[PDB]
Amino acid sequence: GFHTINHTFDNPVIPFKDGIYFAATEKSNVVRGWVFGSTMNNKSQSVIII
Amino acid sequence: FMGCVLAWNTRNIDATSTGNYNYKYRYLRHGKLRPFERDISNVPFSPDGK
Numbered sequence A: 001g002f003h004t005i006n007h008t009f010d011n012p013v014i015p016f017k018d019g020i021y022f023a024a025t026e027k028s029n030v031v032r033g034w035v036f037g038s039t040m041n042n043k044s045q046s047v048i049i050i
Numbered sequence B: 001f002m003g004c005v006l007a008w009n010t011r012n013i014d015a016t017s018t019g020n021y022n023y024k025y026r027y028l029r030h031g032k033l034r035p036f037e038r039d040i041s042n043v044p045f046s047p048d049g050k
Ligand SMILES: *[C@@H]1O[C@H](CO)[C@@H](O[C@@H]2O[C@H](CO)[C@@H](O)[C@H](O)[C@H]2NC(C)=O)[C@H](O)[C@H]1NC(C)=O
Pocket: A038, A039, A043, A044, A045, B030, B031, B039, B041
């Protein structure tokens, strides 16, 4: 589980392990999407869904 | 796989006496691709993995 409250703000890179479940509980569209990539440093194709 | 494969010879426009040098292929990689994968990364390579 993850949580954003007050000062806390978590954006940690998570390994994919060739497939993930995902679920979110939101009151007012807090989460706008994801980003998938391998290196994320000018070296590999990445995708954005928002 | 399910489909058809086609090929034809093109020496008329794809080659010349001085040669055409516009094409490249990747012979070094730490691991074989999975089906229909792609990698367009160009970087220095060293066998140590560093
Ligand atoms: C495609 O996946 C392969 C393997 O899953 C990735 O190759 C790994 O790259 C890291 C980079 O440091 C190496 O340490 C590993 O040894 C490699 N193999 C494995 C099995 O992890 C490759 O990086 C991926 N493609 C891209 C563009 O990143």
